[PDB]
PDB file of C-alpha atoms and ligand atoms in Angstrom:
ATOM      1  CA  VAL A   1     104.128 -15.791 -73.618  1.00 16.36           C
ATOM      2  CA  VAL A   2     107.023 -14.162 -76.241  1.00 17.27           C
ATOM      3  CA  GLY A   3     105.031 -12.341 -78.996  1.00 17.03           C
ATOM      4  CA  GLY A   4     102.097 -11.913 -77.436  1.00 12.62           C
ATOM      5  CA  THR A   5      99.665  -9.259 -77.026  1.00 18.81           C
ATOM      6  CA  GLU A   6      97.300  -8.495 -73.371  1.00 18.74           C
ATOM      7  CA  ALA A   7      93.793 -10.477 -73.367  1.00 21.93           C
ATOM      8  CA  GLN A   8      90.450  -8.580 -72.444  1.00 19.83           C
ATOM      9  CA  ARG A   9      89.521  -9.369 -68.977  1.00 17.39           C
ATOM     10  CA  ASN A  10      86.768 -11.320 -69.008  1.00 21.32           C
ATOM     11  CA  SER A  11      88.246 -12.733 -71.585  1.00 22.11           C
ATOM     12  CA  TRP A  12      90.071 -16.619 -71.513  1.00 22.03           C
ATOM     13  CA  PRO A  13      87.831 -16.893 -67.757  1.00 24.77           C
ATOM     14  CA  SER A  14      89.257 -20.361 -67.104  1.00 25.72           C
ATOM     15  CA  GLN A  15      92.894 -19.529 -66.534  1.00 28.24           C
ATOM     16  CA  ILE A  16      94.415 -19.739 -62.944  1.00 27.76           C
ATOM     17  CA  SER A  17      97.292 -18.439 -61.833  1.00 28.11           C
ATOM     18  CA  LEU A  18      99.058 -21.301 -59.374  1.00 28.96           C
ATOM     19  CA  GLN A  19     101.271 -19.168 -57.065  1.00 29.40           C
ATOM     20  CA  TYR A  20     102.998 -20.082 -53.868  1.00 24.22           C
ATOM     21  CA  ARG A  21     104.133 -18.996 -50.753  1.00 25.25           C
ATOM     22  CA  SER A  22     107.491 -17.342 -51.003  1.00 28.48           C
ATOM     23  CA  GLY A  23     108.416 -16.543 -47.611  1.00 26.33           C
ATOM     24  CA  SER A  24     105.714 -14.372 -46.849  1.00 27.41           C
ATOM     25  CA  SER A  25     104.836 -13.518 -49.803  1.00 28.81           C
ATOM     26  CA  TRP A  26     103.182 -15.624 -52.602  1.00 28.04           C
ATOM     27  CA  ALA A  27     104.571 -16.258 -55.975  1.00 28.54           C
ATOM     28  CA  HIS A  28     103.304 -17.292 -59.126  1.00 28.12           C
ATOM     29  CA  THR A  29     105.072 -20.592 -60.614  1.00 26.92           C
ATOM     30  CA  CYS A  30     102.240 -22.166 -63.345  1.00 24.75           C
ATOM     31  CA  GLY A  31      99.309 -21.863 -65.288  1.00 27.69           C
ATOM     32  CA  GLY A  32      96.174 -23.187 -65.069  1.00 32.27           C
ATOM     33  CA  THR A  33      92.937 -24.447 -66.635  1.00 33.91           C
ATOM     34  CA  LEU A  34      89.878 -24.048 -63.771  1.00 37.06           C
ATOM     35  CA  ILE A  35      87.289 -27.813 -64.829  1.00 38.21           C
ATOM     36  CA  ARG A  36      85.160 -27.803 -61.996  1.00 35.40           C
ATOM     37  CA  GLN A  37      83.925 -25.886 -59.377  1.00 33.25           C
ATOM     38  CA  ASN A  38      86.768 -27.869 -57.038  1.00 32.98           C
ATOM     39  CA  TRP A  39      89.189 -28.695 -59.468  1.00 29.64           C
ATOM     40  CA  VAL A  40      92.289 -27.485 -61.495  1.00 31.66           C
ATOM     41  CA  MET A  41      93.886 -29.558 -64.197  1.00 32.04           C
ATOM     42  CA  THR A  42      97.873 -28.851 -64.328  1.00 34.90           C
ATOM     43  CA  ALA A  43     101.190 -29.689 -65.320  1.00 38.40           C
ATOM     44  CA  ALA A  44     102.628 -31.884 -62.980  1.00 40.59           C
ATOM     45  CA  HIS A  45     106.121 -31.055 -63.252  1.00 41.44           C
ATOM     46  CA  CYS A  46     104.790 -27.946 -61.017  1.00 40.92           C
ATOM     47  CA  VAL A  47     103.636 -29.211 -58.328  1.00 44.35           C
ATOM     48  CA  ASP A  48     106.976 -31.176 -58.226  1.00 42.96           C
ATOM     49  CA  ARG A  49     108.087 -29.709 -55.292  1.00 43.16           C
ATOM     50  CA  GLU A  50     106.885 -29.828 -51.647  1.00 42.37           C
ATOM     51  CA  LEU A  51     105.783 -26.091 -51.314  1.00 43.69           C
ATOM     52  CA  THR A  52     102.562 -24.414 -50.058  1.00 48.14           C
ATOM     53  CA  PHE A  53      99.834 -23.559 -53.135  1.00 47.89           C
ATOM     54  CA  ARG A  54      96.681 -21.663 -53.464  1.00 48.91           C
ATOM     55  CA  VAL A  55      94.999 -20.550 -57.025  1.00 47.72           C
ATOM     56  CA  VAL A  56      93.454 -18.135 -58.315  1.00 45.27           C
ATOM     57  CA  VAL A  57      90.567 -17.159 -59.919  1.00 48.39           C
ATOM     58  CA  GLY A  58      90.021 -14.353 -62.330  1.00 48.71           C
ATOM     59  CA  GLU A  59      92.491 -13.143 -61.781  1.00 46.69           C
ATOM     60  CA  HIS A  60      94.081 -10.201 -64.837  1.00 45.99           C
ATOM     61  CA  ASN A  61      96.947  -8.056 -63.066  1.00 47.68           C
ATOM     62  CA  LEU A  62      99.447  -9.996 -60.980  1.00 48.34           C
ATOM     63  CA  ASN A  63     100.305  -6.935 -59.027  1.00 45.70           C
ATOM     64  CA  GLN A  64      97.037  -4.648 -58.756  1.00 50.00           C
ATOM     65  CA  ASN A  65      93.414  -5.386 -57.221  1.00 50.60           C
ATOM     66  CA  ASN A  66      91.590  -5.949 -60.246  1.00 52.17           C
ATOM     67  CA  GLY A  67      88.541  -6.579 -58.032  1.00 54.11           C
ATOM     68  CA  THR A  68      87.637  -9.827 -59.359  1.00 49.56           C
ATOM     69  CA  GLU A  69      89.782 -12.807 -57.539  1.00 50.37           C
ATOM     70  CA  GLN A  70      88.667 -15.293 -56.026  1.00 49.83           C
ATOM     71  CA  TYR A  71      92.243 -16.882 -53.647  1.00 51.50           C
ATOM     72  CA  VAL A  72      91.716 -20.543 -53.130  1.00 50.36           C
ATOM     73  CA  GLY A  73      93.630 -23.090 -51.303  1.00 48.85           C
ATOM     74  CA  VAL A  74      94.372 -26.391 -52.827  1.00 45.90           C
ATOM     75  CA  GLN A  75      93.350 -28.974 -50.498  1.00 47.07           C
ATOM     76  CA  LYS A  76      94.675 -32.963 -52.518  1.00 47.64           C
ATOM     77  CA  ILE A  77      96.965 -33.096 -55.282  1.00 47.18           C
ATOM     78  CA  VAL A  78      97.246 -35.866 -57.838  1.00 46.75           C
ATOM     79  CA  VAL A  79      99.708 -36.586 -60.364  1.00 48.12           C
ATOM     80  CA  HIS A  80      99.329 -38.879 -62.672  1.00 48.08           C
ATOM     81  CA  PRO A  81     101.158 -42.039 -62.315  1.00 50.01           C
ATOM     82  CA  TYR A  82     103.619 -42.576 -64.683  1.00 50.60           C
ATOM     83  CA  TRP A  83     105.345 -38.421 -64.322  1.00 49.65           C
ATOM     84  CA  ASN A  84     108.727 -39.477 -63.850  1.00 48.88           C
ATOM     85  CA  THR A  85     110.686 -35.490 -62.936  1.00 48.94           C
ATOM     86  CA  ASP A  86     113.896 -36.343 -64.958  1.00 46.45           C
ATOM     87  CA  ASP A  87     112.093 -37.604 -67.609  1.00 47.93           C
ATOM     88  CA  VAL A  88     109.263 -34.953 -68.512  1.00 47.72           C
ATOM     89  CA  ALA A  89     109.824 -35.509 -72.854  1.00 48.57           C
ATOM     90  CA  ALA A  90     108.602 -39.957 -72.360  1.00 48.47           C
ATOM     91  CA  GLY A  91     104.975 -37.345 -71.408  1.00 51.87           C
ATOM     92  CA  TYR A  92     102.330 -37.203 -68.353  1.00 50.12           C
ATOM     93  CA  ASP A  93     102.580 -33.576 -67.250  1.00 52.01           C
ATOM     94  CA  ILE A  94      99.579 -33.659 -66.207  1.00 50.24           C
ATOM     95  CA  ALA A  95      97.877 -33.014 -62.724  1.00 49.87           C
ATOM     96  CA  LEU A  96      94.686 -32.246 -61.042  1.00 50.38           C
ATOM     97  CA  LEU A  97      94.788 -30.278 -58.195  1.00 54.62           C
ATOM     98  CA  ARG A  98      91.604 -30.237 -55.482  1.00 56.18           C
ATOM     99  CA  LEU A  99      90.932 -26.946 -54.343  1.00 58.11           C
ATOM    100  CA  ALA A 100      89.992 -26.430 -50.803  1.00 54.39           C
ATOM    101  CA  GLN A 101      87.098 -24.487 -51.425  1.00 54.55           C
ATOM    102  CA  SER A 102      84.594 -24.328 -54.219  1.00 56.01           C
ATOM    103  CA  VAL A 103      84.833 -21.033 -56.776  1.00 58.36           C
ATOM    104  CA  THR A 104      81.866 -19.166 -57.368  1.00 56.01           C
ATOM    105  CA  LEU A 105      80.564 -18.909 -61.228  1.00 52.82           C
ATOM    106  CA  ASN A 106      80.548 -15.400 -63.317  1.00 52.99           C
ATOM    107  CA  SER A 107      81.871 -13.593 -65.776  1.00 54.33           C
ATOM    108  CA  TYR A 108      85.106 -13.199 -64.679  1.00 55.37           C
ATOM    109  CA  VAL A 109      85.062 -18.027 -63.580  1.00 55.34           C
ATOM    110  CA  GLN A 110      83.936 -20.282 -66.049  1.00 56.23           C
ATOM    111  CA  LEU A 111      84.755 -23.567 -66.447  1.00 56.06           C
ATOM    112  CA  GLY A 112      87.255 -24.634 -69.281  1.00 53.75           C
ATOM    113  CA  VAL A 113      85.445 -27.310 -71.727  1.00 54.78           C
ATOM    114  CA  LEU A 114      88.007 -29.802 -71.948  1.00 55.37           C
ATOM    115  CA  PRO A 115      87.811 -32.044 -76.421  1.00 54.83           C
ATOM    116  CA  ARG A 116      86.049 -35.531 -76.574  1.00 55.28           C
ATOM    117  CA  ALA A 117      88.581 -38.670 -76.229  1.00 56.01           C
ATOM    118  CA  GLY A 118      90.624 -39.138 -78.753  1.00 53.66           C
ATOM    119  CA  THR A 119      90.164 -35.403 -80.353  1.00 60.31           C
ATOM    120  CA  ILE A 120      93.507 -34.379 -82.799  1.00 61.03           C
ATOM    121  CA  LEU A 121      93.176 -31.870 -84.323  1.00 60.52           C
ATOM    122  CA  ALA A 122      94.362 -31.140 -87.994  1.00 60.63           C
ATOM    123  CA  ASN A 123      97.398 -28.833 -88.739  1.00 63.54           C
ATOM    124  CA  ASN A 124      97.627 -25.221 -88.385  1.00 67.22           C
ATOM    125  CA  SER A 125      94.655 -25.269 -86.564  1.00 66.62           C
ATOM    126  CA  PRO A 126      93.727 -22.402 -84.517  1.00 67.75           C
ATOM    127  CA  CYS A 127      94.903 -21.681 -81.091  1.00 67.54           C
ATOM    128  CA  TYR A 128      95.614 -19.291 -78.680  1.00 69.23           C
ATOM    129  CA  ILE A 129      98.643 -19.503 -75.288  1.00 69.83           C
ATOM    130  CA  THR A 130      97.658 -17.754 -73.002  1.00 69.28           C
ATOM    131  CA  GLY A 131      99.444 -18.195 -69.652  1.00 68.04           C
ATOM    132  CA  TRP A 132     101.480 -14.120 -67.098  1.00 66.63           C
ATOM    133  CA  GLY A 133     105.352 -16.310 -67.729  1.00 68.45           C
ATOM    134  CA  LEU A 134     107.627 -15.024 -69.528  1.00 69.35           C
ATOM    135  CA  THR A 135     108.196 -12.149 -71.917  1.00 71.00           C
ATOM    136  CA  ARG A 136     110.735 -13.039 -74.004  1.00 71.05           C
ATOM    137  CA  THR A 137     113.731 -15.620 -73.263  1.00 68.81           C
ATOM    138  CA  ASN A 138     115.727 -15.076 -69.984  1.00 65.07           C
ATOM    139  CA  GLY A 139     113.029 -12.721 -69.328  1.00 62.89           C
ATOM    140  CA  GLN A 140     110.296 -11.304 -67.133  1.00 63.83           C
ATOM    141  CA  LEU A 141     106.995 -12.707 -65.848  1.00 60.31           C
ATOM    142  CA  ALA A 142     103.885 -10.191 -67.536  1.00 60.60           C
ATOM    143  CA  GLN A 143     102.002  -8.395 -65.398  1.00 58.49           C
ATOM    144  CA  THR A 144      98.536  -8.162 -66.784  1.00 57.99           C
ATOM    145  CA  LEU A 145      97.676 -11.919 -68.969  1.00 58.92           C
ATOM    146  CA  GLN A 146      99.047 -12.202 -72.193  1.00 60.78           C
ATOM    147  CA  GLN A 147      98.006 -14.317 -75.302  1.00 61.55           C
ATOM    148  CA  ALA A 148      99.020 -15.782 -78.452  1.00 56.08           C
ATOM    149  CA  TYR A 149      97.744 -16.733 -81.690  1.00 56.23           C
ATOM    150  CA  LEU A 150      99.007 -20.047 -82.103  1.00 57.75           C
ATOM    151  CA  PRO A 151      98.620 -22.575 -84.473  1.00 59.39           C
ATOM    152  CA  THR A 152      98.995 -26.519 -84.411  1.00 59.08           C
ATOM    153  CA  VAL A 153     101.649 -28.119 -86.083  1.00 59.27           C
ATOM    154  CA  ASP A 154     100.212 -31.594 -86.896  1.00 56.83           C
ATOM    155  CA  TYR A 155     102.976 -35.212 -85.357  1.00 56.63           C
ATOM    156  CA  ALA A 156     104.375 -35.996 -88.293  1.00 56.57           C
ATOM    157  CA  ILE A 157     105.491 -32.849 -89.181  1.00 55.46           C
ATOM    158  CA  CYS A 158     106.432 -31.732 -85.193  1.00 56.75           C
ATOM    159  CA  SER A 159     108.221 -35.191 -85.144  1.00 58.51           C
ATOM    160  CA  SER A 160     110.575 -34.960 -87.908  1.00 58.96           C
ATOM    161  CA  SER A 161     114.067 -34.200 -87.310  1.00 57.43           C
ATOM    162  CA  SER A 162     114.084 -30.062 -88.442  1.00 56.07           C
ATOM    163  CA  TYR A 163     111.316 -30.193 -85.514  1.00 52.64           C
ATOM    164  CA  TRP A 164     111.391 -31.968 -81.907  1.00 52.67           C
ATOM    165  CA  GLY A 165     112.396 -35.517 -83.664  1.00 52.55           C
ATOM    166  CA  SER A 166     112.156 -37.889 -81.115  1.00 47.98           C
ATOM    167  CA  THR A 167     111.732 -36.026 -78.069  1.00 48.80           C
ATOM    168  CA  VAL A 168     108.461 -35.328 -78.695  1.00 46.12           C
ATOM    169  CA  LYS A 169     104.959 -38.265 -78.125  1.00 45.90           C
ATOM    170  CA  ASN A 170     101.844 -38.224 -80.186  1.00 45.33           C
ATOM    171  CA  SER A 171     100.527 -37.895 -76.486  1.00 46.93           C
ATOM    172  CA  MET A 172     101.463 -34.812 -76.979  1.00 44.37           C
ATOM    173  CA  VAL A 173     101.025 -31.800 -79.131  1.00 43.11           C
ATOM    174  CA  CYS A 174     102.602 -28.882 -80.557  1.00 42.65           C
ATOM    175  CA  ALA A 175     101.270 -25.629 -81.911  1.00 45.73           C
ATOM    176  CA  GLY A 176     104.136 -22.625 -83.028  1.00 47.42           C
ATOM    177  CA  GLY A 177     107.039 -22.752 -83.351  1.00 51.18           C
ATOM    178  CA  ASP A 178     107.600 -19.485 -86.245  1.00 52.26           C
ATOM    179  CA  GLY A 179     110.446 -18.094 -84.384  1.00 55.19           C
ATOM    180  CA  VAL A 180     108.465 -15.008 -82.458  1.00 50.72           C
ATOM    181  CA  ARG A 181     105.328 -16.606 -80.541  1.00 50.33           C
ATOM    182  CA  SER A 182     105.660 -18.905 -77.523  1.00 47.50           C
ATOM    183  CA  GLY A 183     105.121 -20.192 -74.659  1.00 47.51           C
ATOM    184  CA  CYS A 184     108.072 -19.465 -71.871  1.00 49.14           C
ATOM    185  CA  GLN A 185     108.564 -20.350 -68.285  1.00 48.49           C
ATOM    186  CA  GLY A 186     105.653 -19.484 -66.034  1.00 47.55           C
ATOM    187  CA  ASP A 187     103.460 -20.412 -69.049  1.00 48.03           C
ATOM    188  CA  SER A 188     102.977 -24.254 -67.671  1.00 49.17           C
ATOM    189  CA  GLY A 189     100.489 -26.327 -66.586  1.00 47.67           C
ATOM    190  CA  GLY A 190      98.694 -23.504 -68.634  1.00 48.86           C
ATOM    191  CA  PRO A 191      95.991 -23.271 -71.445  1.00 46.77           C
ATOM    192  CA  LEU A 192      96.135 -24.167 -75.349  1.00 47.81           C
ATOM    193  CA  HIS A 193      92.749 -22.750 -76.639  1.00 48.24           C
ATOM    194  CA  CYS A 194      91.479 -24.660 -79.410  1.00 47.06           C
ATOM    195  CA  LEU A 195      88.366 -23.808 -81.968  1.00 48.40           C
ATOM    196  CA  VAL A 196      86.527 -26.963 -83.054  1.00 48.44           C
ATOM    197  CA  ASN A 197      82.289 -26.621 -83.690  1.00 48.68           C
ATOM    198  CA  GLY A 198      82.202 -22.728 -83.180  1.00 51.12           C
ATOM    199  CA  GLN A 199      83.979 -23.519 -79.514  1.00 49.68           C
ATOM    200  CA  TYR A 200      87.324 -22.878 -77.763  1.00 49.15           C
ATOM    201  CA  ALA A 201      88.652 -26.008 -75.997  1.00 50.45           C
ATOM    202  CA  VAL A 202      91.730 -26.504 -73.957  1.00 50.51           C
ATOM    203  CA  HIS A 203      93.177 -29.042 -76.395  1.00 52.41           C
ATOM    204  CA  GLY A 204      96.797 -28.293 -74.422  1.00 51.63           C
ATOM    205  CA  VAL A 205      98.446 -27.955 -70.965  1.00 52.76           C
ATOM    206  CA  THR A 206     101.543 -26.787 -71.256  1.00 54.52           C
ATOM    207  CA  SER A 207     104.742 -28.724 -71.160  1.00 55.70           C
ATOM    208  CA  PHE A 208     107.879 -27.762 -72.528  1.00 56.41           C
ATOM    209  CA  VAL A 209     110.307 -25.135 -75.228  1.00 57.78           C
ATOM    210  CA  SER A 210     114.007 -25.960 -76.542  1.00 54.89           C
ATOM    211  CA  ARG A 211     116.835 -25.668 -73.946  1.00 58.47           C
ATOM    212  CA  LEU A 212     118.250 -23.041 -77.041  1.00 59.07           C
ATOM    213  CA  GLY A 213     114.975 -20.404 -75.248  1.00 58.06           C
ATOM    214  CA  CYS A 214     111.489 -20.286 -75.557  1.00 58.40           C
ATOM    215  CA  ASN A 215     110.964 -18.680 -79.612  1.00 60.59           C
ATOM    216  CA  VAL A 216     112.972 -21.038 -81.444  1.00 59.29           C
ATOM    217  CA  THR A 217     112.320 -21.791 -85.119  1.00 61.52           C
ATOM    218  CA  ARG A 218     111.155 -25.529 -85.436  1.00 60.86           C
ATOM    219  CA  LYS A 219     111.082 -25.604 -81.866  1.00 61.05           C
ATOM    220  CA  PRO A 220     107.155 -24.983 -81.918  1.00 61.01           C
ATOM    221  CA  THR A 221     105.553 -25.318 -77.915  1.00 59.83           C
ATOM    222  CA  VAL A 222     105.132 -28.327 -76.597  1.00 62.03           C
ATOM    223  CA  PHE A 223     101.939 -29.109 -74.341  1.00 61.24           C
ATOM    224  CA  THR A 224     100.606 -31.909 -72.602  1.00 59.56           C
ATOM    225  CA  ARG A 225      97.678 -33.317 -75.085  1.00 56.83           C
ATOM    226  CA  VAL A 226      94.334 -33.416 -73.212  1.00 57.34           C
ATOM    227  CA  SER A 227      92.196 -35.449 -75.084  1.00 57.45           C
ATOM    228  CA  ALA A 228      94.986 -38.414 -74.215  1.00 59.05           C
ATOM    229  CA  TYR A 229      93.413 -38.222 -70.737  1.00 59.90           C
ATOM    230  CA  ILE A 230      90.315 -37.821 -70.774  1.00 60.82           C
ATOM    231  CA  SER A 231      89.466 -41.416 -69.004  1.00 60.67           C
ATOM    232  CA  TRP A 232      92.409 -40.261 -66.390  1.00 62.60           C
ATOM    233  CA  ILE A 233      90.646 -37.335 -65.088  1.00 63.33           C
ATOM    234  CA  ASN A 234      87.476 -38.218 -65.473  1.00 64.70           C
ATOM    235  CA  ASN A 235      87.592 -40.905 -63.068  1.00 67.17           C
ATOM    236  CA  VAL A 236      90.101 -39.275 -60.928  1.00 68.27           C
ATOM    237  CA  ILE A 237      87.502 -36.807 -59.692  1.00 66.40           C
ATOM    238  CA  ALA A 238      85.232 -39.159 -59.516  1.00 67.63           C
ATOM    239  CA  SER A 239      86.627 -41.088 -56.878  1.00 67.54           C
ATOM    240  CA  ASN A 240      87.796 -37.989 -54.960  1.00 68.84           C
TER     241      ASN A 240
HETATM  242 CA1   CA B 301      95.157  -8.738 -59.798  1.00 67.15          CA
END
């Protein structure tokens, strides 16, 4: 997250760290959201590589024992059948990870609330982006969980020639674009939490940013719109 601030510990308890085995070590690669005690929602391009993954829940400081962590392996990866690795702008940037074990829910570890299918936000709707990704373009991972206030940019605006044009599809959400705050590499797959009916729900899965850089005026961060995938999500969880 560019332009964020440190989150409080219990602030976003559905946030996960998606990590891969790097020798004898594990590196954070992506965010996710915990959607069932044994299911994680992330971006398909996070799991494009045949790596060995694991999920950390109740995580706050990547480098340090928090006393809250749970570490679980990944048993099965379900990428959207239509996802195309060479065309992120075609959308379908979404995957479901079935965990080797069911995590324990507590105040550090909760399920994410998803929106009703079809739900679209108004322009300038109050959302936060969370994650451990790069805190500047070409920069480094955050040690601690960062949050940034990142209001939505509607489709009519985001798809106009000034902003993203054609690159962006109505199956996506844009948020931010002020030139200051943004998502950045390592935040992909994580949540965009939006306040609706006095609740935070997860409206986005962080998908991409500009090639120019993370925080670029008039290039909001682009998310997979979760409300477009509700029936797919439920149909996977129901039959797996
Ligand atoms: Ca830790």
